[PDB]
Amino acid sequence: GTSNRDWWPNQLDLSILHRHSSLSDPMGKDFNYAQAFEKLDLAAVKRDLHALMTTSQDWWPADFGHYGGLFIRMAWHSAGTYRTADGRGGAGEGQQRFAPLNSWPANANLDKARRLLWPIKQKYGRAISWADLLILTGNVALESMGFKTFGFAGGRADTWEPEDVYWGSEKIWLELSGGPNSRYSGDRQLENPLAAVQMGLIYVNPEGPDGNPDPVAAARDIRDTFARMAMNDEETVALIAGGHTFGKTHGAGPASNVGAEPEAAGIEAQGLGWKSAYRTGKGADAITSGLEVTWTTTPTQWSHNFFENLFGYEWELTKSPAGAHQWVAKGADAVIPDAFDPSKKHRPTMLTTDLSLRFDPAYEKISRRFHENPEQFADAFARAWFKLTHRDMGPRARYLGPEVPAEVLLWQDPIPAVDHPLIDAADAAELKAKVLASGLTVSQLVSTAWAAASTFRGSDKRGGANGARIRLAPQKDWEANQPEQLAAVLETLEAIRTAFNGAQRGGKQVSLADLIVLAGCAGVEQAAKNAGHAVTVPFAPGRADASQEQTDVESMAVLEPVADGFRNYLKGKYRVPAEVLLVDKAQLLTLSAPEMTVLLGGLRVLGANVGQSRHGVFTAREQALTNDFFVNLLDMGTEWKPTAADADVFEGRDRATGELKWTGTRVDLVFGSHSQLRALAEVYGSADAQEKFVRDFVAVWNKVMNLDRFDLA
Amino acid sequence: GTSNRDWWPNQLDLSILHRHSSLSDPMGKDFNYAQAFEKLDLAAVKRDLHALMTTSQDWWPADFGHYGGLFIRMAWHSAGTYRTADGRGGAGEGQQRFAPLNSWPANANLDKARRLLWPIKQKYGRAISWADLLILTGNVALESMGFKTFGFAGGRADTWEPEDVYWGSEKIWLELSGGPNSRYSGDRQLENPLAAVQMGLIYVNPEGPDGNPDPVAAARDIRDTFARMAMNDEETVALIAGGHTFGKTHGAGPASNVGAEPEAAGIEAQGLGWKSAYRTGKGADAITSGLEVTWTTTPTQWSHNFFENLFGYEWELTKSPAGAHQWVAKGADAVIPDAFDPSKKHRPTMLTTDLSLRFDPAYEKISRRFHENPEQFADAFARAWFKLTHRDMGPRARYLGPEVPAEVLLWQDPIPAVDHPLIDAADAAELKAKVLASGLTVSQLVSTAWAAASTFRGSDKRGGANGARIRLAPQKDWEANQPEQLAAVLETLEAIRTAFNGAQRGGKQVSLADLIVLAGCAGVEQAAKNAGHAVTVPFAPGRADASQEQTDVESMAVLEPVADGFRNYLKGKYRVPAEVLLVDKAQLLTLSAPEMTVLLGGLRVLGANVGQSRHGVFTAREQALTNDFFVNLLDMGTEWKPTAADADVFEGRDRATGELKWTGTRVDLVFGSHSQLRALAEVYGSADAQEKFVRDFVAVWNKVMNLDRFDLA
Ligand code: HEM
Ligand code: HEM
Ligand SMILES: [Cl-]
Ligand SMILES: [Cl-]
Ligand code: NA
Ligand code: NA
């Protein structure tokens, strides 16, 4: 059936902005997962899960009698898709159960793991999401085996369709680097925003880079991909060693015995895949990765045996029964238990990537400290596992249930508690009047608030105006934020805030985070007034101001807008067309196509462009809130041509006279080109639309201002 | 960026069921287009449109000084995509403005026509949809040029994204037959549901079949494709001759001069395409189809000259300036006006397909009658133009405005007006009690009402339970409808209705259409009682009974369910998998994926299957309304295998014992296989879900029962 994407494969795709509609959601429109979960008997769930660990099912028998290792692997894969570059991936939406993740080669036989959990999911129903359950199962695995976890938060609502993520351009699973769609270039530079070395892997290849079994070189890939998942070297060592304390790998026979992944399998498979023709196809005969490694003498108990073995033996290269490269301690004794035959023992074995923790010099320092001080290893692993499994959950205000850790971690971009009374409506009105009387302009006010609020991304729920991190390093110096202009605005606002707060009784005060957003609301209200309309923009107090010491500068770097179509800004020259980057940013802001369209055309006429560029400012009344962007963009009396100097900038000239009327970028002119976006622009460019435009702009503005306000959820 | 459709190109696609969400719609949730239209001053719009006809714009100058031909072509192409097989295409959604229709080769330069209309669209805003405006413009064109139309109805609400329609499998525009994805097989048999001879054409190729200029063979294609658009011979001749009374074709130079279609063009084209390098690119130099024909001596006025010329000359084959086949009148004087140069005249010309009207013997008799009796031609063309442009609008209750024709037409599947008091809630209770006391079972009652209601399709808004057409030819004999069982149900219900109606005062009576639906509601209520739930199903009276004379049997044939997964029914063996046919039917019923899911699982346990099949009846309490379908489908204690006799039937056996528990089809098992459908099934198969399942079932049931109830809109 030939489709529009077949005929016009490079047209812009807006369907990413209308995923997750009420149409695809089985739950009622009023369903609130937080309320369901808060009444779950979490202790009862955990008892069920503990019992499950040692209750083998014949269709996928448990190694050693215990599913703990499989479940820890399942939880780490759930979390292990996360990328800091964009925040996409991670455990927070339970996407392991949908395509394509459910059928990635690295996720083989995790379909069995998910299926073992159906009875428990069924029993508790809507009160526990899959997304929470995958993680909670990994925690119960660890606790059942003697490991003390750092805690657990619920609150990951389930989703109902695949997210649209760029996982790479390769058309072959696992393709080695250097091919026609290579994700590497230069000196082994992985393309942003990817965080895995091959399509279908989680971070790295367990045999070594493109299959070369060199621990030293494997360590370079580990370091790079874990950094792209926001983990430093201490965390990375703790996670790998901690995970490979438990369980085993599966590679009993040749890989050619393994059949179709779940999305390819027959309907009779009922959502499972990788059926194997090797012997019984399961249990002792299981094939998953093709490696056949068991790291420790007690695979079902926490220990410090991973590092005892790693340092205590010398290692030689060998092949598993499937032909993969792996390492064995020859002339160790046969001290490692077999998974199913109590009369068989095995020598210690290791992956290439495990040996990286010893042979990379920076890793070896850390591994040696963890070997000599296994309580330090256990604390680091507990901390890193909580980070791994909660990194995309957003502000601590989202965390639910009785096991939330009290300690506030730097990586959570923490917001101080508010311990004072909040401003009321009359106070908000007084501050809005003060702001407008200071001389700050509509453009200054809207641009500052937009800069503060628009760092939010729904992928990982990081960013937004709460915290007033605009005023701190590094956001105060991001080029998109116009650092000198911003500094002058913030000085003026801080003086207003100091005056107001000095005049109060009773402990009432306004934060700078709330004032930045309230000042942007005053800009919007004044722009509506400039156009002849009286509107009140909604405002919700309660943001707090974070300190510099509460702000990790390096982790904040990935939130820098290097393309922000809403401010007609491109930090440099990218391969991806600017209009594609605009839709990406709209998706991160959680905007639909209509909301993106109204928002952009309003920002243009309010003066939100970086550098006060005239591109897209299709109005003769700048700083008034009107639909002039749309009316002027859609006027057929204007003819548009790319400039000689820059093919991405366009001049709009009167068709009859040739007189120059406007300039625009691709981001501006796509709204007059793309057949769906132009249908939207037409609505807002119609003669009956001025009221609609103002109402819808104010609504979307308020939506952006409140993205991170899970304290009000 | 590699997508799930790249990896798994034959996985079932559910996004068709969640198009048209509130997310992509710019209008607020409560917007009601009928209410907006009803307050439009349609007379003012029509004055503006008459003014536009001779307001030539320099970027696409009007032929003869009058855009009327261009606009009639625009309206006929709007409507001309309709297919009776599925109801998809047509004018009623304004899909011409979106991909792919906006960029079909046969729609070349209609982007100009639509852009001429923007000022009028802009002026009236939301009170006139594009979909209504395209048709209204065509009517005004005709009226401007001297032809009195039959009438016009508004009410076509705009849509905001492309509909998902199968337009063919070819990967080359215009591909001639017999390619790897040929739409023809056999003795020129066009594949259902297609109604065009080549990808990107409307009905037929104006040069002849696959480009061969044989008028007689052309006529076979005309007849077949027009019939697939619901037109008979009289209507087809009236339409073609009527259309080609106006305007001209455009083929002034080689087609190699014409550039990218709109979806391919540069952003600076601002939504237009087919830019031509031939001379001025427009007006006298225009290139659209490549043909250069002007049919009549007065191309801007209604006349009887089409048939005068067709019969009055003999025709010679020639080539246009672009090299397309066309015909010129032998020995004729230069009597046809030029479009731009008053000093030039041209000989009469015709397309191959125009000569079909003379050289096909059935057409010739009609053509000759219209030539001799031009009042008959004029009435036929007015009637056909109204049918062409309204065939997909649905029941007359949807027709809005002051120009609706009063005459009721057979093709409208007319429903008689209700002229008596309707039953009230007390009466509905009394009739549900009578139904349950007759002995009719849950299975009988649900199956009959489902058979009556599920003929509805949202594509053209045909079908549904109003009318009680289930009791007429041909629906009473459709295999899916179980004719002998149905006749016994209808006899029992007709006796109940006769007894009730005989006992009334004051003119009160119940229709059989209402009683069928109310009897199905009673069956649902009884099934809920069987399962221990106290449920009242909503019911809205007001349906009327249509007569046999009001029911065109041939036109009803396209509404026969040859696949209805809701009743586990397939009439024969098709190429398309049965689960794909299910999603198609759910799309016609306007169901989302959750609604499809809940409705199937309920119908299975209520006994709706055709032939009382046990396939998918995953319950030990048939005729009770429970979520058993889902709980038993998802039980991992059951293993599924395809049968030896039939690979599309599956046996479910106890995994431990081997005992046979259930059988099922692909439609049943896809809910356990497809990762998005299985997620939905899980919600309804959870321990907390029985009440949710019942409530959601009753809601979707009532939805289906009410699909055609535009009298209540
Ligand atoms: C360099 C990063 C890593 C590599 C390349 C890697 C590689 C793999 C491979 C190839 C398997 C075998 C799959 C099978 O054949 O069954 C696996 C198993 C496992 N991994 Fe990792 N791993 C990585 C990091 C992690 C981390 C961060 C954790 C968790 C904290 C983890 C926990 C596990 C567990 C528990 C198993 C055993 C599964 C079982 O018993 O069924 N791994 N590892
Ligand atoms: C067998 C069915 C038909 C065929 C193959 C056909 C073919 C075409 C073609 C090839 C053009 C020339 C396009 C261009 O070069 O500008 C055209 C023009 C046009 N057709 Fe048809 N036609 C069909 C039926 C219809 C019908 C049913 C109507 C309307 C009732 C219609 C009304 C028009 C009008 C008014 C024009 C002139 C456009 C102008 O003045 O710009 N045609 N036809
Ligand atoms: Cl994601
Ligand atoms: Cl359609
Ligand atoms: Na994410
Ligand atoms: Na349709």
Query: Are B378 and B517 contained in the same domain?
Result: no
From A70, A1, A144, select the one nearest B165 (Cα to Cα). A1
- For atom 19 of ligand 2, the residue with the nearest CA is B73
Host H or E run for residue A73: helix A68-79
Task: List, by residue number, the catalytic residues of A.
Answer: 77
Q: What does residue A660 show for φ and ψ, rounded to 5 degrees?
A: -75, 125
Report residue B682 as tokens.
Answer: 């899980």
What gap in Å lies between CA B679 and CA B697, rounded to an integer?
Answer: 17
Overall residue count recorded for chain A in this entry: 713
| End-to-end Cα, chain A, rounded Å | 44
What gap in Å lies between CA A386 and CA A412, rounded to an integer?
Answer: 11
Atom of ligand 2 nearest to the CA of B293: 12
Query: Are B27 and B149 contained in the same domain?
Result: yes
Query: Are B516 and B604 contained in the same domain?
Result: no
Ligand 1 centre and the CA of A76: distance in Å?
A: 8
For residue B384, which amino acid is it?
A
Q: What does residue B58 show for φ and ψ, rounded to 5 degrees?
A: -70, -25
What gap in Å lies between CA B376 and CA B116, rounded to an integer?
Answer: 34
* Interface membership of B679 toward A (CB under 8 Å): yes
User: Which residues of chain A lie closer than 8 angstroms to B680, CB-CB?
Assistant: 26, 160
Query: Are A222 and A149 contained in the same domain?
Result: no
From A349, A131, A353, select the one nearest A236 (Cα to Cα). A353
Query: Are B6 and B27 contained in the same domain?
Result: yes
From A320, A551, A369, select the one nearest A455 (Cα to Cα). A551
> Which residues, including other chains, have CB under 8 Å from residue B401's CB and lie 6 or more apart?
B37, B38, B40, B42, B152, B153, B154, B155
From A516, A569, A568, A506, select the one nearest A539 (Cα to Cα). A516
| End-to-end Cα, chain B, rounded Å | 44
Which of B4, B18, B88, B697 best tests the A interface by mutation, with the highest count of A CBs <10 A? B18
Query: Are B151 and B284 contained in the same domain?
Result: no
Q: Cα distance from A75 to chain B (closest Cα, Å)? A: 19
Q: Cα distance from A684 to chain B (closest Cα, Å)? A: 9
Q: Among positive and negative, which fits the CA dihedral B613, B618, B621, B624? A: negative
From A458, A557, A630, A558, select the one nearest A16 (Cα to Cα). A458
Q: Cα distance from A170 to chain B (closest Cα, Å)? A: 7
Query: Are A36 and A72 contained in the same domain?
Result: yes
A309 to each of A244, A304, B271, B376, how far by Cα in Å?
12, 9, 67, 98
- Helices B233-243 and B352-359, interaxial angle, to 10°? 140
Peptide bond into B100 cis (omega under 30): yes
What gap in Å lies between CA B315 and CA B348, rounded to an integer?
Answer: 9
Q: What is the DSSP letter of B248?
A: B
Q: Which of A328, A357, A372 is the last residue of a domain?
A: A372
CA atoms within 13 A on the CB side of A119: 11
Q: Are B470 and B477 a contacting pair, CB within 8 Å?
A: no
* Residue A665: strand, helix, or coil: strand
**Which A residues in the span 245-264 are in contact with B, Cβ-Cβ below 8 Å?**
262-264
Q: What is the CATH number of the domain that holds B435?
A: 1.10.520.10
A608 to each of A456, A467, A600, how far by Cα in Å?
17, 22, 9
Peptide bond into A474 cis (omega under 30): yes
User: Which residues of chain A lie closer than 8 angstroms to B99, CB-CB?
Assistant: 4, 7-8, 11, 675
What gap in Å lies between CA A432 and CA A453, rounded to an integer?
Answer: 18
The pick from A142, A244, A246, A386 for probing ligand 1's pocket by mutation, whose C-beta has the most ligand atoms within 8 angstroms, reads A244
* Residue B501: strand, helix, or coil: helix
Do the chains contact at A688 and B126, CB–CB below 8 Å?
yes
Residue A342's CB is within 10 A of a number of other CB atoms, namely 7
Tell how far CA B325 is from the center of its chain. 33
Q: Which of A355, A387, A407 is the last residue of a domain?
A: A407
Query: Are B173 and B242 contained in the same domain?
Result: yes
What is the resolution in angstroms? 1.6
For residue A419, which amino acid is it?
D
Tell me what percent of chain A is helix, strand and coil, each rounded to the nearest 5. 45, 10, 45
Query: Are B395 and B493 contained in the same domain?
Result: no
From B381, B397, B400, select the one nearest B132 (Cα to Cα). B400
Paired residues of B639 in beta bridges: B653
A41 to each of A48, A116, A601, B471, how far by Cα in Å?
11, 20, 49, 55
What gap in Å lies between CA A276 and CA A285, rounded to an integer?
Answer: 9
Q: What is the gyration radius of the CA atoms in chain B, in angstroms?
A: 28
What gap in Å lies between CA B11 and CA A162, rounded to an integer?
Answer: 13
Query: Are A220 and A267 contained in the same domain?
Result: yes
A244 is in an annotated binding site: yes
Residue A243's CB is within 10 A of a number of other CB atoms, namely 21
Ligand 1 centre and the CA of A244: distance in Å?
A: 6
- For atom 30 of ligand 2, the residue with the nearest CA is B243
Ligand 1 centre and the CA of A366: distance in Å?
A: 20
Q: Are B307 and B377 a contacting pair, CB within 8 Å?
A: yes
Q: What is the CATH number of the domain that holds B634?
A: 1.10.420.10
Paired residues of B652 in beta bridges: B640, B662
Give the range of the structural domain holding residue B274, as residue numbers without chain letter.
168-372
Tell how far CA B153 is from the center of its chain. 17
- For atom 31 of ligand 2, the residue with the nearest CA is B243
Instruction: Provide the domain count of chain A.
Output: 4
From A550, A527, A523, select the one nearest A539 (Cα to Cα). A523
Q: What is the DSSP letter of B570?
A: E
What gap in Å lies between CA B127 and CA B32, rounded to an integer?
Answer: 10
Overall residue count recorded for chain B in this entry: 713
Report residue B582 as tokens.
Answer: 């299910």
* Interface membership of B171 toward A (CB under 8 Å): yes
What gap in Å lies between CA A573 and CA A453, rounded to an integer?
Answer: 25
Question: A247 in ligand 1 pocket by Cβ < 6 Å?
Answer: yes
Residue matched to tokens 């991806």: A576
Question: B288 in ligand 2 pocket by Cβ < 6 Å?
Answer: yes
H helices of A117-214, where?
118-124, 130-144
Query: Are B283 and B346 contained in the same domain?
Result: yes
Query: Are A523 and A618 contained in the same domain?
Result: no
> Which residues, including other chains, have CB under 8 Å from residue A502's CB and lie 6 or more apart?
none
Report residue B451 as tokens.
Answer: 């058979």
Report residue B296 as tokens.
Answer: 């009549």
Q: Cα distance from B53 to chain A (closest Cα, Å)? A: 17
Residue B443's CB is within 10 A of a number of other CB atoms, namely 18
What gap in Å lies between CA A177 and CA A181, rounded to an integer?
Answer: 8
- For atom 5 of ligand 1, the residue with the nearest CA is A206
User: Which residues of chain B lie closer than 8 angstroms to A601, CB-CB?
Assistant: none
Q: Which long-range contacts (CB under 8 A, 24 or more apart) does B166-173 make?
A: B166/A1, B166/B193, B166/B194, B167/A2, B167/B100, B167/B194, B167/B196, B167/B199, B168/A2, B168/B194, B168/B196, B168/B199, B169/A1, B169/A2, B170/A2, B170/B198, B170/B199, B171/A2, B171/A6, B172/B199, B173/B105, B173/B199, B173/B200
Report residue B650 as tokens.
Answer: 């599956």
Report residue B373 as tokens.
Answer: 């009796």
Output the CA angle B527-B532-B537, nearest 5 degrees: 45
Q: How many helices (H) and strands (E) does chain B have?
A: 24, 12
What gap in Å lies between CA A214 and CA A210, rounded to an integer?
Answer: 10
